[PDB]
Amino acid sequence: MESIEQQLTELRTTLRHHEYLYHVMDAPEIPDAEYDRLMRELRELETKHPELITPDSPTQRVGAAPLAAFSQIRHEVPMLSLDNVFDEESFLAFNKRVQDRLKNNEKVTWCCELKLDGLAVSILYENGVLVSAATRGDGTTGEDITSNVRTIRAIPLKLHGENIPARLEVRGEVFLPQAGFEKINEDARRTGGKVFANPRNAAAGSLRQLDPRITAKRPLTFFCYGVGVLEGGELPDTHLGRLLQFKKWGLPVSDRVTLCESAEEVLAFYHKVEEDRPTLGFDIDGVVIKVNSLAQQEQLGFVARAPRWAVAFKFPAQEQMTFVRDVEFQVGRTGAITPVARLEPVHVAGVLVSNATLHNADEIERLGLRIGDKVVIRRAGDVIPQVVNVVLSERPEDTREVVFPTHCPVCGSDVERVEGEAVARCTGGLICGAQRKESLKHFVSRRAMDVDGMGDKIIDQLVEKEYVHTPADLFKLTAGKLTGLERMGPKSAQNVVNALEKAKETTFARFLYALGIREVGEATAAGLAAYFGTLEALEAASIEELQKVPDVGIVVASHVHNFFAEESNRNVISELLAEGVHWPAP
DNA sequence: CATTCCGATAGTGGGGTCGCAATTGT
DNA sequence: ACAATTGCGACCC
DNA sequence: CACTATCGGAATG
Ligand SMILES: *OP(=O)(O)OC[C@H]1O[C@@H](n2cnc3c(N)ncnc32)[C@H](O)[C@@H]1O
Numbered sequence: 001m002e003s004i005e006q007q008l009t010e011l012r013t014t015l016r017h018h019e020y021l022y023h024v025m026d027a028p029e030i031p032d033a034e035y036d037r038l039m040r041e042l043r044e045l046e047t048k049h050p051e052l053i054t055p056d057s058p059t060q061r062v063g064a065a066p067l068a069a070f071s072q073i074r075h076e077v078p079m080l081s082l083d084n085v086f087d088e089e090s091f092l093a094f095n096k097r098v099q100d101r102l103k104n105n106e107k108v109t110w111c112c113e114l115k116l117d118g119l120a121v122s123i124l125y126e127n128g129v130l131v132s133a134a135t136r137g138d139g140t141t142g143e144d145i146t147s148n149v150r151t152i153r154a155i156p157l158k159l160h161g162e163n164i165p166a167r168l169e170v171r172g173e174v175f176l177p178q179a180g181f182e183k184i185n186e187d188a189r190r191t192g193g194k195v196f197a198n199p200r201n202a203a204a205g206s207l208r209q210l211d212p213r214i215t216a217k218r219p220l221t222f223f224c225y226g227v228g229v230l231e232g233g234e235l236p237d238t239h240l241g242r243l244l245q246f247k248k249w250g251l252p253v254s255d256r257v258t259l260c261e262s263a264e265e266v267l268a269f270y271h272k273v274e275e276d277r278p279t280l281g282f283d284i285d286g287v288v289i290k291v292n293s294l295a296q297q298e299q300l301g302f303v304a305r306a307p308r309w310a311v312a313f314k315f316p317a318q319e320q321m322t323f324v325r326d327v328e329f330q331v332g333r334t335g336a337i338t339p340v341a342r343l344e345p346v347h348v349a350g351v352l353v354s355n356a357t358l359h360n361a362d363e364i365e366r367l368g369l370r371i372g373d374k375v376v377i378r379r380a381g382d383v384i385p386q387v388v389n390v391v392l393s394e395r396p397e398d399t400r401e402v403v404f405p406t407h408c409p410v411c412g413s414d415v416e417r418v419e420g421e422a423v424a425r426c427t428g429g430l431i432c433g434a435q436r437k438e439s440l441k442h443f444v445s446r447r448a449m450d451v452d453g454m455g456d457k458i459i460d461q462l463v464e465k466e467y468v469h470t471p472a473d474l475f476k477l478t479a480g481k482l483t484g485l486e487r488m489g490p491k492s493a494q495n496v497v498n499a500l501e502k503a504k505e506t507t508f509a510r511f512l513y514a515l516g517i518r519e520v521g522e523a524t525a526a527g528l529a530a531y532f533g534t535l536e537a538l539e540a541a542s543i544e545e546l547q548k549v550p551d552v553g554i555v556v557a558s559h560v561h562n563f564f565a566e567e568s569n570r571n572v573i574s575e576l577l578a579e580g581v582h583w584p585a586p
Numbered sequence: 587c588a589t590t591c592c593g594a595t596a597g598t599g600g601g602g603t604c605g606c607a608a609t610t611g612t
Numbered sequence: 613a614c615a616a617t618t619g620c621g622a623c624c625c
Numbered sequence: 626c627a628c629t630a631t632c633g634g635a636a637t638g
């Protein structure tokens with residue numbers, strides 16, 4: 001309610017104060033994640049009132065600004081994923097889905113783009129002025145990388161054409177072309193520097209640098225592919241049309257973007273790009289096919305993790321060979337026992353591969369895999385290690401059978417492989433230390449209670465030393481007790497207590513998900529949350545009423561019902577609430 | 587309607603690099 | 613008593 | 626980030 005001038009000055013005062021403490025204490029940086037935040041808030045208010053900007057304002061920073069801790073930025077519009085298709089048939093299925101859905105909106109035109117291989121970045125432009133830039137994070141909240149993005153030559157600090165909207169969030173890929181990647185490695189080996197493994201991870205590392213001066217020396221570039229929040233302007237209903245407009249604003253846009261009228265045209269485009277792939281000058285992992293019309297785009301809507309109007313049409317992945325040195329079994333929070341191949345380290349498409357999931361016992365039999373076997377490996381989708389097949393012809397004289405454990409490798413309990421099901425799991429329950437660990441690990445994960453600083457190691461030790469038994473115990477911990485832990489310390493322990501405290505404020509959906517109810521993942525957690533609104537109506541629901549919730553049948557209904565039916569869980573929840581955990585009432 | 591098909595999730599798995607701070611070295 | 617290493621978790625794909 | 630099993634619900638005969 002306080003006037004503009006009074007708001008500007010209160011932001012500048014806090015900013016100039018942080019800079020003061022920085023110099024005084026002779027600090028290495030500004031440990032306050034609230035310095036980058038305040039700065040973007042000042043920029044947002046300033047671009048809004050270009051006449052209320054002073055030459056003394058921190059926004060007119062004359063030279064290198066003081067280093068500051070990374071802050072976060074919320075995405076009004078989610079930065080989701082893409083459903084993948086790997087072959088012409090997979091695409092035709094996608095095409096059928098889009099068609100069968102739409103009601104005689106017949107004219108479906110496909111906008112086709114290269115799927116660049118770097119990292120996603122969202123850039124907010126207010127009245128044509130670049131105010132902030134953020135990564136994707138969990139889709140809702142991402143890291144503020146404004147300082148690093150400002151050093152990217154290809155990204156204009158201000159747009160220029162006509163009808164520039166009041167608010168325009170530009171989404172695209174930041175990346176290192178091959179020549180830039182090689183230039184950086186040539187410099188690393190010349191000096192004592194460390195060389196990067198590939199351009200994707202090098203580009204990402206560059207944007208996580210605390211000191212922008214270092215980022216400025218990385219020849220990062222950018223390409224627009226979409227839009228986030230949009231307010232004002234006169235943008236067209238065609239996706240291509242919009243990119244064409246961005247290009248006119250001065251934003252960088254790939255000249256390869258094309259329009260296809262049929263599925264055959266899309267396929268032709270796919271093979272065309274596959275052929276010129278080596279002449280691009282940068283890496284790609286495929287092409288993105290999307291409904292060009294923003295209207296139809298809205299009719300198709302999104303699913304949990306991705307739009308229904310687009311797919312990433314990926315290229316086949318580069319294969320390599322190596323051998324299995326061993327197969328280990330890891331226990332998950334729901335008791336699941338997953339086999340993992342330990343491989344002889346081999347380089348594949350830019351990275352060192354040492355491990356690959358084997359999924360389950362059926363997969364191991366399908367492959368006929370034995371310890372010692374030679375295998376064909378590949379980074380599926382150009383990211384994840386996958387064991388394609390065993391090379392029988394080269395099976396060593398001496399190989400060892402892979403024996404699925406009949407007793408959990410942790411608590412020793414019996415393993416259960418239910419009739420007709422493929423998954424085998426540990427039956428120890430609360431007795432199993434691996435389940436306890438994985439469960440607490442899941443409770444603390446980014447899409448759950450999001451407790452920064454709590455990882456596999458700290459959790460392992462807390463469960464090992466019997467300090468924690470249930471989620472509630474996590475908040476009873478004090479700096480004193482944490483300080484005396486392996487790889488733990490005074491400030492380190494304080495950061496955890498702080499993160500735990502901050503984690504108290506959540507949402508019903510995240511809390512529900514954090515509880516780890518069988519078959520209740522993030523999507524179902526949100527559905528149940530939105531349906532009942534309160535933890536009361538939920539645990540008071542019957543199996544028959546639970547089945548009224550969309551996408552919830554008897555399996556889920558029963559698991560949910562049996563979960564709250566247990567006093568055990570009732571007190572875990574009640575204790576968490578007692579501990580302080582809470583969320584916005586509907 | 588009984589089966590089969592399929593869209594959408596759940597659950598569990600991988601590697602690179604950087605900042606912070608625990609830990610080791612001068 | 614700082615300075616240089618390096619374990620761990622964040623957080624990219 | 627990818628894969629597979631599984632669940633819920635739509636499609637098939
Ligand atoms: O499945 P996923 O999470 O890897 O995919 C989402 C990411 O795909 C990238 N990308 C690259 N090119 C495009 C185009 N042209 N359109 C939409 N997305 C694109 C993004 O970086 C995104 O996060």
Ligand SMILES: [Zn+2]
Pocket residue numbers: 331408409410411412413426427428432433434435
């Ligand atoms: Zn066990």
